[PDB]
Structure 1
Amino acid sequence: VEMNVQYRVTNPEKYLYSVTSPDDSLRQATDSALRGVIGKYTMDRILTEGRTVIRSDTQRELEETIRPYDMGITLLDVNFQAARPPEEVKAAFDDAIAARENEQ
């Protein structure tokens, strides 16, 4: 799974005098929130149907997580990039599609 997050910075006093390296803290928080969100949902729904609820849950979780830090960062958009399975099972997925064609 990969994810991209776009954010702005407001009230620079908070950004400068609250947390050391706020960007790294936000990256760690984003990774934690993404792990927590993906943990709850099943694989196939993440692959195909949940790609909208996954992002919606991740953005809310990140906003709730970075609240105590009181960093100056405000959040614009959290967008879900790709949730491809590993290559080894990707071979099996391609084999399944070829199996459908062979069945015909």
Structure 2
Amino acid sequence: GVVTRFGKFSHLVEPGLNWKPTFIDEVKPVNVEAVRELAASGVMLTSDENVVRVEMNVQYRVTNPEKYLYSVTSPDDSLRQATDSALRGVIGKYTMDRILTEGRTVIRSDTQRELEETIRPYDMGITLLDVNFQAARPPEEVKAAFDDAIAARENEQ
């Protein structure tokens, strides 16, 4: 709980049964010990003018509500915009072929590190827990040929 004076914040109450003078101060609780989720996807552009359908999942948590509540408006939404910029910027550096097989491990690391650097000035109370890359499948328009390329190997054999 976050006990707060009419306009001003008063003090942080710990779990249990507390008392607040009715009509004078109000409490606003926040969950700070429970994993959250923020899935960010989009049709990003690679470094070789190729298109790749990448999707990512960002599991995070929050911290002391003084920062989370009074740092930026809509902290969940604002973080999502930062995540998109990081993912596109990161994807923008590597080529399509790399991102599909090799980039899987580094892309999450770079996007996670960039996302943290992007939200350092904000001072928000959001803490990044893990960035687990989900998929980097190619565009559906070219997927047909990508499947044929594998079928061609079997046809060759």
TM-score range, shorter chain: over 0.9
Runs of 4+ off more than 2 Å = none
Give 1:87 deviation, angstroms. Answer: 1.3
- Using the size of structure 1 for normalisation, the TM-score is 0.96
**Percent of aligned pairs sharing the same letter:** 100
Cα displacement string for residues 22-59 of structure 1 (whole angstroms, at most 9, x for unaligned residues): 00000000111000000001111111112111111110
SS at match of 1:91: helix
- Using the size of structure 2 for normalisation, the TM-score is 0.64
Higher helix share: 1
SS at match of 1:15: helix
Higher strand share: 2
- The 2-side partners of 1:60 and 1:88 are apart by 32
Cα displacement string for residues 62-87 of structure 1 (whole angstroms, at most 9, x for unaligned residues): 00000111101011001101010111
Aligned residues: 104
RMSD: 0.8
The structure with the larger Rg is 2
